[PDB]
Amino acid sequence: VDGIQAEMRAMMVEATN
Amino acid sequence: ASAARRKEQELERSQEQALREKIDSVLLPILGYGNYTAQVDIQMDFSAVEQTRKRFDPNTPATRSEYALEDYNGSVRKESTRNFELDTTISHERKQTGTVARQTVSVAIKDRPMSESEINAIRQVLIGTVGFDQGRGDLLNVLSVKFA
Amino acid sequence: ASAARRKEQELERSQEQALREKIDSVLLPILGYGNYTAQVDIQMDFSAVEQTRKRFDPNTPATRSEYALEDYNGSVRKESTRNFELDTTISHERKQTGTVARQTVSVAIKDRPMSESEINAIRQVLIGTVGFDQGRGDLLNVLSVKFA
Amino acid sequence: ASAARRKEQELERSQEQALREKIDSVLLPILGYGNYTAQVDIQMDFSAVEQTRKRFDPNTPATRSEYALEDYNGSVRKESTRNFELDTTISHERKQTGTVARQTVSVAIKDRPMSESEINAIRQVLIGTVGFDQGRGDLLNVLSVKFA
Amino acid sequence: ASAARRKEQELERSQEQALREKIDSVLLPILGYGNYTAQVDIQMDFSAVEQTRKRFDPNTPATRSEYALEDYNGSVRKESTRNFELDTTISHERKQTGTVARQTVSVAIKDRPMSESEINAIRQVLIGTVGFDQGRGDLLNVLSVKFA
Amino acid sequence: ASAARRKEQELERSQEQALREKIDSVLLPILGYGNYTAQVDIQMDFSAVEQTRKRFDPNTPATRSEYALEDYNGSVRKESTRNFELDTTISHERKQTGTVARQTVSVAIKDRPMSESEINAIRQVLIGTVGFDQGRGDLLNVLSVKFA
Amino acid sequence: ASAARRKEQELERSQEQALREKIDSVLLPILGYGNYTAQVDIQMDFSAVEQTRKRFDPNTPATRSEYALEDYNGSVRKESTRNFELDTTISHERKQTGTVARQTVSVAIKDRPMSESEINAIRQVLIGTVGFDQGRGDLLNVLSVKFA
């Protein structure tokens, strides 16, 4: 849910970095 | 879905058969043909657990911004504002459906009885032959009985 | 849906038959042909439980932002504002429909009676032959009766 | 829907027949042919229960945000505001329609009578042969009567 | 998905077979043909863990902007505002599905018994032959038993 | 994905075979044909780590803009505002999937035993023949056993 | 990607083969045919590092604009505003994927033994024959063993 979406956003931050 | 339940029963029976085959492959040389009997019960859970954990680290914060006002006169006013950054772990786990939740194995050895030392040695071989896991709730009985 | 109920009855009967087959495979060598009789009752629940748990960790909070005003004069004013981050576990479980809720096994051994030691040994073999689970409410009776 | 009720009656009768078959399979060797009679009544509920439970954990709250004002002068003002996060379990269960709500079994044994010990032994075999469940309200009568 | 579970069972059995082949390749020259028996149990987890960690470095901050007001009169007012930059590591890990969670190996050596020194030497060879990992919970039994 | 797991098993077995080939290529001249036996276990991790690190240099800041007000009267007011530029390293690393996490090698030498000096010399040759890495957790056993 | 891992294994094996060829080309004239054996282990990292560094020069700033107010009365007010320009280096590096992270070479020389001086001379030749790099963690063993 919200926590999983936050995890996905963190992975997206990783990809952008 | 009842077909799925049928195939789950098939999976459990297949596991039991494989364990019985291994038991035979170990005990047939050691004991001989027809000098033992063994049966195996395997109970398998088929839940659909799916867990998401979000863990922090309270004891190692990193200050991002900070304000600190400290005036005197007597009067002593100590205002403070602080923002922190914390270690954040987000783990999403998805367990496998069918897992052996409990395993029961019983072996009966034909008399002519067997000494305690050899019974315990056979038990030690089986532990490892079957993958005995007491912490899982598994049970392993080895008895010396009189075959008719 | 009544066809589904019929197939559930079929599943229960199949489980009972399999357990009876295992009982025979164990007792036929030990006791012989026609020296025993055994029947098995298996009750299976077919509910559709589906649970979602959201658990926190009260004892390890991590401060995210913090404000603290503490002025003196006498007068002592201690204002404070605090925001926390907590460990959050979110687990979604979906139980399997048909699960053995209770298992009953009874075995009767033909007399000529049987000693208590051998009765208990047969009981020990069955425990593991069938997968006896007392905590589930299962029941296992072994008696020595007079066949006609 | 009356066709559904007819098939429910068929299900109940099929269950009774299966239990009678098991009773015969157990008692025919033990007692013999024509030395006993047994009949089984099975009452099955066909409701459509569907429950949703939302449970919390009052004794382990986790503070999310917190405000606390405590000033002195005498005058003592203690303001406080607190927000909590609680363990939340949400379970949706859907019971199976047809469930055996009560089971009645009666067995009559032909005289030449039977001793109390053997009557109780037969009762013990039946308990497990049928899956006797007293907590469900089931009833099991074993009598020794004079056949004509 | 039950086909996937079947293929997982196949993977586990294949691993066990490979380990048995290696055990044979080591022990057949050392002990001989038919002087030993060995069986291997391999339990493999098939979860789908996927973790994201965001870690900071509290003890090495770098000041980005800074304001500092410090006036006297007596009265001493020390205002301060500070912004920091911190070391930020963001690691996304995705574990492999099937991993050997526990490994059990048992080897039985035919008597004519074996001395403790040679038993321990065989155990040392197996440690490395199989890849014994006690920290994983693996178990390795080597016994000297009497073959029939 | 289970096909991928199968090919991972194939990769591990291929690595083990290659290491065994190298072991043979070294020991066959030194010891001879049939005077030794050796087996290799290779455990390979197949995670998907992908890390991003953003590191600063706190101890060498460079002032970009600066304001400094310092008035006296007695009263001493020292206002100051400062902006900094810092060394910024941003490294994105992506680890290779399959990496040897632990390596176990065991070699058994046929007796007629071997002296400690030659055992240690063989161990030294193997260290470098296999690429022994103790810091990785690798293990290398060399024993002198009695072949049958 | 597993095909990529296979080709990485091929690259490592090719490197090892080339180093072995060079070792032979050096030692075959010096020692002779069949008087030595040597094996090479090469471990290669295949990460995907990609770094961006932004470095400044704190100790050589260049003032771009400047304001300075300095009034007296007693009262002494010293206001100042300053803007700086700094040396800025921005380097983007992208490391090559496959790099030899550790290299292990072991050479065994047939006895009839070899003196320490000649062993060290052979070691010196190999250092340069292989490109020995101790700072990388490489290891080079040269032993005098008894060939069978």
Q: What is the 3-state secondary structure (H, E, C) of E18-62?
A: HHHHHHHHHHHHHHCCCCEEEEEEEEEECCCCEEEEEEECCCCCE
Instruction: Give B95 to chain A, closest Cα distance, Å.
Output: 16
Looking at the partner chain, which of D4, D69, D94 has a beta carbon nearest the beta carbon of C2?
A: D4
Instruction: Give A14 to chain C, closest Cα distance, Å.
Output: 22
Give me the sheet containing C99-110, strands edge to edge: C36-45, C99-110, C139-145
Which residues precede gaps in chain B, with C-N > 2.5 A?
Answer: 73, 112
Spatial contact of E25 and F20, defined as CB atoms under 8 Å apart: no
Chain F residues lying within 8 Å of A17, measured CB to CB:
52, 54, 90, 92
Q: Which residues contact E31 (CB under 8 A, 6 or more apart)?
A: E109, E122, F148
Q: Do A1 and C90 touch (CB under 8 A)?
A: yes
Instruction: Give B146 to chain E, closest Cα distance, Å.
Output: 18
Provide φ and ψ at D48, rounded to 5°.
Answer: -130, 50
- Residues facing B65 on adjacent strands: B83, E83
Alpha helix ranges (H) inside chain G: 2-31, 116-129
Tokens 């008035």 locate to: F71
Give the pairing type, strands F88-94 and F50-56.
antiparallel
Give the pairing type, strands E99-110 and E139-145.
parallel
Q: Is C68 helix (H, G, I), strand (E, B) or coil?
A: strand
C to F contact (≥3 Cβ pairs closer than 8 Å): no
C-alpha span between D83 and D60 (Å, rounded): 13
Q: Do D128 and C41 touch (CB under 8 A)?
A: yes
Chain B residues lying within 8 Å of A4, measured CB to CB:
52, 90, 92
- Which amino acid is located at F104 in the chain? T
Chain B residues lying within 8 Å of A3, measured CB to CB:
52, 54, 90
DSSP one-letter code for D97: S
Closest-CA residue to G49 (of F64, E34, F50):
F50
For the record, the structure tokens of E114 come out as 């074996």
C-alpha span between C25 and F38 (Å, rounded): 43
Characterize B41-50 residue by residue with b for buried, 16 or more Cβ atoms within 10 angstroms of its Cβ, and e for exposed: bbbbbbbebb
Looking at the partner chain, which of D25, D31, D133 has a beta carbon nearest the beta carbon of C39?
A: D25
Using a 10 angstrom Cβ sphere, with 0-12 exposed, 13-18 middle and 19 or more buried, the burial of residue D56 is exposed
C-alpha span between F15 and F9 (Å, rounded): 10
The neighbours of chain A, by the rule of 3 or more Cβ pairs under 8 Å, are: B, C, E, F
Chain A residues lying within 8 Å of B90, measured CB to CB:
3-4, 6-7, 10
F–G CB contacts, 8 A cutoff, strictly below: 162
C-alpha span between B115 and D75 (Å, rounded): 85
Q: Do C106 and D118 touch (CB under 8 A)?
A: no
Provide φ and ψ at G118, rounded to 5°.
Answer: -70, -35
C-alpha span between C125 and B141 (Å, rounded): 7
Q: How was this structure determined?
A: cryo-EM
Q: Do A3 and B88 touch (CB under 8 A)?
A: no
C-alpha span between B43 and B8 (Å, rounded): 11
- Residues facing B72 on adjacent strands: B76
C-alpha span between F55 and F87 (Å, rounded): 8
Characterize C28-63 residue by residue with b for buried, 16 or more Cβ atoms within 10 angstroms of its Cβ, and e for exposed: ebbbeeebbbbbbbbbbbbbebbbbbbbbbbeebbb
Interface probe, candidates B10, B42, B66, B96, chain E, greatest E C-beta count within 10 A: B96
C-alpha span between C26 and B148 (Å, rounded): 12
Whether the CA torsion F20, F25, F26, F29 is positive or negative: it is positive
Strands (E), D2-98: 36-45, 50-56, 62-72, 76-85, 88-94
- Residues facing E67 on adjacent strands: E81, F81
- Which amino acid is located at D80 in the chain? S
C-alpha span between E62 and F88 (Å, rounded): 10
A to B contact (≥3 Cβ pairs closer than 8 Å): yes
C to D contact (≥3 Cβ pairs closer than 8 Å): yes
Give me the sheet containing B36-45, strands edge to edge: B36-45, B99-110, B139-145
Interface probe, candidates B40, B129, B132, B134, chain E, greatest E C-beta count within 10 A: B129
Q: Do B5 and C89 touch (CB under 8 A)?
A: no
B–C CB contacts, 8 A cutoff, strictly below: 162
Q: Do A4 and B88 touch (CB under 8 A)?
A: no
Provide φ and ψ at E71, rounded to 5°.
Answer: -115, 150
Spatial contact of E67 and F67, defined as CB atoms under 8 Å apart: no
Chain A residues lying within 8 Å of C87, measured CB to CB:
none
- Residues facing C106 on adjacent strands: C39, C141
Interface membership of C90 toward A (CB under 8 Å):
yes
Query: CA F21 from chain center: how many Å?
Result: 23
Tell me the structure's resolution in angstroms, rounded to a single decimal.
Answer: 3.2
C-alpha span between F103 and E128 (Å, rounded): 8
C-alpha span between E28 and E19 (Å, rounded): 14
C-alpha span between E108 and E20 (Å, rounded): 13
Q: Do E85 and F6 touch (CB under 8 A)?
A: no
Interface membership of E55 toward A (CB under 8 Å):
no
Tokens 């004509």 locate to: D148
Chain A residues lying within 8 Å of F50, measured CB to CB:
14
Spatial contact of C56 and D85, defined as CB atoms under 8 Å apart: yes
Q: Give chain F's radius of gyration (CA, Å).
A: 30
Which residues precede gaps in chain A, with C-N > 2.5 A?
Answer: none
Q: Which residues contact B88 (CB under 8 A, 6 or more apart)?
A: A10, B54, B55, B56, E53, E54
C-alpha span between F24 and F18 (Å, rounded): 10
Chain B residues lying within 8 Å of E84, measured CB to CB:
62-66
C-alpha span between D131 and D104 (Å, rounded): 11
Spatial contact of E148 and E113, defined as CB atoms under 8 Å apart: no
Chain A residues lying within 8 Å of C88, measured CB to CB:
3
Spatial contact of F103 and F133, defined as CB atoms under 8 Å apart: yes
Using a 10 angstrom Cβ sphere, with 0-12 exposed, 13-18 middle and 19 or more buried, the burial of residue G55 is middle
Interface membership of F134 toward A (CB under 8 Å):
no
Chain A residues lying within 8 Å of E54, measured CB to CB:
10
> How many C-beta atoms lie closer than 10 Å to residue F107's C-beta?
24
Provide φ and ψ at D142, rounded to 5°.
Answer: -125, 120
Interface probe, candidates G7, G8, G35, G55, chain F, greatest F C-beta count within 10 A: G55
Looking at the partner chain, which of G55, G81, G148 has a beta carbon nearest the beta carbon of F35?
A: G148
A–C CB contacts, 8 A cutoff, strictly below: 3
C-alpha span between C72 and C13 (Å, rounded): 81
C-alpha span between B61 and C84 (Å, rounded): 12
Chain G residues lying within 8 Å of F126, measured CB to CB:
106
DSSP one-letter code for F97: S
Q: Do B54 and A10 touch (CB under 8 A)?
A: no
Chain C residues lying within 8 Å of A1, measured CB to CB:
90
Chain A residues lying within 8 Å of B92, measured CB to CB:
4, 7
The neighbours of chain E, by the rule of 3 or more Cβ pairs under 8 Å, are: A, B, F
Spatial contact of E39 and B27, defined as CB atoms under 8 Å apart: no
Closest-CA residue to C50 (of E121, D134, G141, D95):
D95
Chain C residues lying within 8 Å of A3, measured CB to CB:
88, 90
Chain F residues lying within 8 Å of G2, measured CB to CB:
4, 7-8, 11, 98
- Residues facing G22 on adjacent strands: none
Q: Do E56 and B65 touch (CB under 8 A)?
A: no
C-alpha span between C36 and C20 (Å, rounded): 12
A to D contact (≥3 Cβ pairs closer than 8 Å): no
Give me the sheet containing F36-45, strands edge to edge: F36-45, F99-110, F139-145
C-alpha span between G117 and G112 (Å, rounded): 16
Strands (E), chain C: 36-45, 50-56, 62-72, 76-85, 88-94, 99-110, 139-145
Using a 10 angstrom Cβ sphere, with 0-12 exposed, 13-18 middle and 19 or more buried, the burial of residue D82 is exposed
Tokens 């000297």 locate to: E144
Provide φ and ψ at F118, rounded to 5°.
Answer: -70, -35
Contacts 24+ apart (CB under 8 A), D46-52: D46/D8, D46/D97, D46/D98, D47/D95, D47/D97, D48/D97, D49/D94, D49/D95, D50/D93, D50/D94, D50/D95, D51/D92, D51/D93, D51/D94, D51/D95, D52/D90, D52/D91, D52/D92, D52/D93
Q: Which residues contact G120 (CB under 8 A, 6 or more apart)?
A: none
Helices C2-31 and B2-31: angle between axes, nearest 10 degrees? 10
Closest-CA residue to B88 (of B61, B51, B109, B70):
B61
Whether the CA torsion D144, D145, D146, D147 is positive or negative: it is negative
The neighbours of chain B, by the rule of 3 or more Cβ pairs under 8 Å, are: A, C, E
Instruction: Give B6 to chain E, closest Cα distance, Å.
Output: 11
Q: Which residues contact E11 (CB under 8 A, 6 or more apart)?
A: E44, E98, F2, F5, F6, F9
Integer distance in angstroms from the first to the last C-alpha of chain B? 45
The C-alpha angle with vertex G139 and arms to G135 and G143, in degrees rounded to 5, equals 145
Which residue from B minimizes the CA distance to C64?
B84
Distances (CA, A) of G148 to F28, F110, G88, G111, G142: 9, 13, 66, 10, 18
Which H helix or E strand runs over E72? strand E62-72
Spatial contact of D44 and D5, defined as CB atoms under 8 Å apart: no
The neighbours of chain F, by the rule of 3 or more Cβ pairs under 8 Å, are: A, E, G
